[PDB]
From Swiss-Prot, chain A:
Gene Ontology BP annotations: cytoplasmic translation
Organism: Saccharomyces cerevisiae (strain ATCC 204508 / S288c)
Cofactor binding remark: Binds 1 zinc ion per subunit.
Family in the record: Belongs to the universal ribosomal protein uS14 family.
Family matches, as Gene3D superfamilies: 30s Ribosomal Protein S14, Chain N
Protein name: Small ribosomal subunit protein uS14A
From Swiss-Prot, chain B:
Protein family: Belongs to the universal ribosomal protein uS3 family.
Name the UniProt record assigns to this protein: Small ribosomal subunit protein uS3
Phosphothreonine modifications at: 42
Subunit structure: Component of the small ribosomal subunit (SSU). Mature yeast ribosomes consist of a small (40S) and a large (60S) subunit. The 40S small subunit contains 1 molecule of ribosomal RNA (18S rRNA) and 33 different proteins (encoded by 57 genes). The large 60S subunit contains 3 rRNA molecules (25S, 5.8S and 5S rRNA) and 46 different proteins (encoded by 81 genes).
Function of the protein: Component of the ribosome, a large ribonucleoprotein complex responsible for the synthesis of proteins in the cell. The small ribosomal subunit (SSU) binds messenger RNAs (mRNAs) and translates the encoded message by selecting cognate aminoacyl-transfer RNA (tRNA) molecules. The large subunit (LSU) contains the ribosomal catalytic site termed the peptidyl transferase center (PTC), which catalyzes the formation of peptide bonds, thereby polymerizing the amino acids delivered by tRNAs into a polypeptide chain.
Subcellular location(s) of the protein: Cytoplasm
Misc remark: Present with 146000 molecules/cell in log phase SD medium.
Swiss-Prot record, chain D:
Similarity comment: family membership: Belongs to the universal ribosomal protein uS10 family.
Full protein: residues contained: 67 to 121 of 121
Oligomer status and interactors: Component of the small ribosomal subunit (SSU). Mature yeast ribosomes consist of a small (40S) and a large (60S) subunit. The 40S small subunit contains 1 molecule of ribosomal RNA (18S rRNA) and 33 different proteins (encoded by 57 genes). The large 60S subunit contains 3 rRNA molecules (25S, 5.8S and 5S rRNA) and 46 different proteins (encoded by 81 genes).
Domain of life of the source: Eukaryota
PTM characteristics: N-terminally acetylated by acetyltransferase NatA. Also partially acetylated by NatC.
Protein name in the entry: Small ribosomal subunit protein uS10
Numbered residues of crosslink Glycyl lysine isopeptide (Lys-Gly) (interchain with G-Cter in ubiquitin): 35
Function statement: Component of the ribosome, a large ribonucleoprotein complex responsible for the synthesis of proteins in the cell. The small ribosomal subunit (SSU) binds messenger RNAs (mRNAs) and translates the encoded message by selecting cognate aminoacyl-transfer RNA (tRNA) molecules. The large subunit (LSU) contains the ribosomal catalytic site termed the peptidyl transferase center (PTC), which catalyzes the formation of peptide bonds, thereby polymerizing the amino acids delivered by tRNAs into a polypeptide chain.
UniProtKB/Swiss-Prot annotation, chain E:
Keyword terms, alphabetized: Acetylation, Cytoplasm, Isopeptide bond, Ribonucleoprotein, Ribosomal protein, Ribosome biogenesis, Ubl conjugation
Entry GO CC: cytoplasm; cytosol; cytosolic small ribosomal subunit
Positions bearing the Glycyl lysine isopeptide (Lys-Gly) (interchain with G-Cter in ubiquitin) cross-link: 17, 28, 57
Protein name, UniProt field: Small ribosomal subunit protein uS19
Length: 53, 56, 96, 55, 124, 71
RNA sequence: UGAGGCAAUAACAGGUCUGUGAUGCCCUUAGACGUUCUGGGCCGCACGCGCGCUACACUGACGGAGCCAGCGAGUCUAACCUUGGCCGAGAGGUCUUGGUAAUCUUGUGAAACUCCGUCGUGCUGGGGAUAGAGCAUUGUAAUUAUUGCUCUUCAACGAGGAAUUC
RNA sequence: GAGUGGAGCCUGCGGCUUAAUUUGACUCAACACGGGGAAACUCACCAGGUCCAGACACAAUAAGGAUUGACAGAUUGAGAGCUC
């Protein structure tokens, strides 16, 4: 009701975040996965990204 | 529906990553130990592998 | 918080029904799936219900997993007055 | 990705890969066998897809 | 004499035509960046700004500048409909009074308010 | 850090006045009642809500602001 | 075999509370160190240091023309990769089109490079800084000029001290 | 061998400047590093304006109303009832 509490959040770094933590900074957006590289390494297993080479 | 195959398979792994979490919190006092997710016709099946199934 | 008794009754009726409530960590949503109220109304009315016992809270990955308990059952059984042994997701469906 | 949460160190880069293998087989048959052969042969983790048609 | 000097020309238009030509006819004769900004967004912008700007220049002590009208829109482009008014062109803190002249046309307000205290190196 | 400055003057809030208010209504000598101040023709304000009486102004407050009847 | 992945014991007061709804303790908490909105700032410029990009041309610049890769990536409850057709000097525009992809973009007709010409050592036609003016694209927003284009302006730099990277 | 170090700009760091010019890091192992290409955002800085999203306990106020909102105007950068 209070027409006074927001401004374009359609694009750029502020539109987004990280589905685990909220960090706008350091986001892997590839493959529509949207994880900050610091939570990407802490999950990379459970997602299925592993280390062959 | 209607997604790319890559995007689908990554998306499924994120679906795994999150589920494992939600259980790894929720069922701590029930000795939760991992999940598996099996897809079929009709249903979508998730099996909690935990060491106290009478409390789940 | 501050919310009319109408939106409290949408929350309390709904939760007594489903026994479990879900809410993504994102105020400024205005309406959330399934409950015709402000998102903020839900989270806060819930956390209110939680700090006094009643319902437990869980978070993980931005999404807040709300679990009604048995004493909590007693309370909206009062708030919705409905008779002793009223409802809750405590009947094991048809034969599923 | 860089290995460090922060910024210090040598600039160790890592690299993660997930392996997506695709296969397709074509069969001509009735409706009974498709339905028989598809409900079973179920496998968690493998994605089975069955279309139809010539277009 | 006879020639009371002569008015300004924006790009071939003297003062008076620009005075009652209309904004849309102005920007139409404005350049690249202007006809773009005026193209897009046509639903509520220099709104009550222009109703205050004109009610000031009306409520004017006659043969004198109108009262300053402050605004934060460092981004407005200057149109003949605002020629001769006094605008408080915010710069970060405090509104810089600036008189709009027939030659500042189509420049942004913010080029007329400095956002930074020059430099002075060494010194003491 | 730095802490505190102020060229003074702090902002207040609101008060919601006082008023025993709803004396507005008049009962004659036993016992006919005639209302005072005119009510709002909006379907949401079932004519129980009234209109504030200023200047030109007659304003519906239940309609948390809505609309502008003037008599 | 070439190249990686993994990798014991132990050590550092190395970095990270500025990735985390990981956290102790301390601070603050309504005249907010909470959050949000408006605007500016991180870009500010006498100048020191580092990583670099483009050059000083003739094994070259320019103009025709020859014409060849590999690792990628791409749009649902949406506007991603974009062929073709016209229009436009250009940037671009516009009507259409294929692709959730070894199927469409794409043979990614890349660039050095090859070839026939022009120039001819002259700060030259090497170099393209700085600036003027006009045109477009992204975006609510382009001023301190997001980027692109045309024209014009035509710097320093004639191979680089001690030093020092790979 | 191909360079850097000299030149032009690009970029980080220092210093100065500044309302602020957010900040970590300073030999190899700091300085095209924080995935750090910042117009809003990001944002931590600066000049200003809102909101509480202060659970819960008890006490107090208080249905003769505890509290909430607002049209216009004044005001405000602003079609913020911020305030009046
Ligand atoms: Mg918001
Ligand atoms: Mg200043
Ligand atoms: Mg009354
Ligand atoms: Mg081998
Ligand atoms: Mg230390
Ligand atoms: Mg950390
Ligand atoms: Mg802390
Ligand atoms: Mg982060
Ligand atoms: Mg963790
Ligand atoms: Mg703080
Ligand atoms: Mg910076
Ligand atoms: Mg240095
Ligand atoms: Mg380096
Ligand atoms: Mg050539
Ligand atoms: Mg290929
Ligand atoms: Mg033309
Ligand atoms: Mg289509
Ligand atoms: Mg020469
Ligand atoms: Mg020359
Ligand atoms: Mg040249
Ligand atoms: Mg600008
Ligand atoms: Mg600046
Ligand atoms: Mg930018
Ligand atoms: Mg040399
Ligand atoms: Mg040498
Ligand atoms: Mg800081
Ligand atoms: Mg070393
Ligand atoms: Mg801001
Ligand atoms: Mg508000
Ligand atoms: Mg309190
Ligand atoms: Zn994260
Ligand atoms: Zn009404």
């Amino acid at each position: 009701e209070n027409v006074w509490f927001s401004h374009p959040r359609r694009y750029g770094k502020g539109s987004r975040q990280c589905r685990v933590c909220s960090s706008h900074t350091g986001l892997i957006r590839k493959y529509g996965l949207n994880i900050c590289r610091q939570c990407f390494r802490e999950k990379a297993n459970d997602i299925g990204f592993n280390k062959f080479r | 529906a209607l997604i790319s195959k890559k995007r689908k398979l990554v998306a499924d792994g994120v679906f795994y990553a999150e589920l494992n979490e939600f259980f790894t919190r929720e069922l701590a006092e029930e000795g939760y130990s991992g999940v598996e997710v099996r897809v079929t016709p009709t249903k979508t099946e998730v099996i909690i592998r935990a060491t106290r199934t009478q409390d789940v | 918080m501050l919310m009319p008794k109408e939106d409290r009754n949408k929350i309390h009726q709904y939760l007594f029904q489903e026994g479990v409530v879900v809410a993504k960590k994102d105020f400024n949503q205005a309406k959330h799936e399934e409950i015709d109220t402000k998102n903020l109304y839900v989270i806060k009315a819930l956390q209110s219900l939680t700090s006094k016992g009643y319902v437990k809270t869980q978070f993980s990955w931005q999404y807040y997993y709300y679990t009604l308990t048995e004493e909590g059952v007693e309370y909206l059984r009062e708030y919705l007055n409905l008779p002793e042994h009223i409802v809750p997701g405590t009947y094991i469906q048809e034969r599923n | 990705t860089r290995k460090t949460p922060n910024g210090e160190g040598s600039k160790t880069w890592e690299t993660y890969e997930m392996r997506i293998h695709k296969r397709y087989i074509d069969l001509e048959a009735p409706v009974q066998i498709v339905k028989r052969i598809t409900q079973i042969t179920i496998e968690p983790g493998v994605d089975v897809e069955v279309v139809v048609a010539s277009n | 004499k006879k020639r009371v000097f002569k008015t300004h020309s924006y790009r071939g238009v003297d003062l008076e035509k620009l005075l009652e030509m209309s904004t849309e006819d102005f920007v139409k004769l404005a350049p690249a960046r202007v006809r773009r900004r005026f193209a897009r967004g046509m639903t509520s912008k220099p709104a009550g700004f222009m109703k205050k700007l004109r009610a000031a220049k009306l409520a004017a002590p006659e043969n004198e500048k109108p009262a300053p009208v402050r605004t934060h829109m460092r981004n407005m482009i200057i149109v003949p409909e605002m020629i001769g008014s006094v605008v408080g062109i915010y710069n970060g803190k405090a509104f810089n009074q600036v008189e709009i002249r027939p030659e500042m046309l189509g420049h942004y307000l913010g080029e007329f308010s400095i956002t930074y205290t020059p430099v002075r190196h060494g010194r003491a | 850090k730095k802490v505190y400055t102020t060229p003074k003057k702090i902002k207040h809030k609101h008060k919601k006045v006082k008023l025993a208010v709803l004396s507005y209504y008049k009962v004659d000598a036993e016992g006919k009642v005639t209302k005072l101040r005119r009510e709002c023709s909006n379907p949401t304000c079932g004519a129980g809500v009234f209109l504030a009486n200023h200047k030109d102004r007659l304003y519906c407050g239940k309609c948390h602001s809505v609309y502008k009847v003037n008599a």
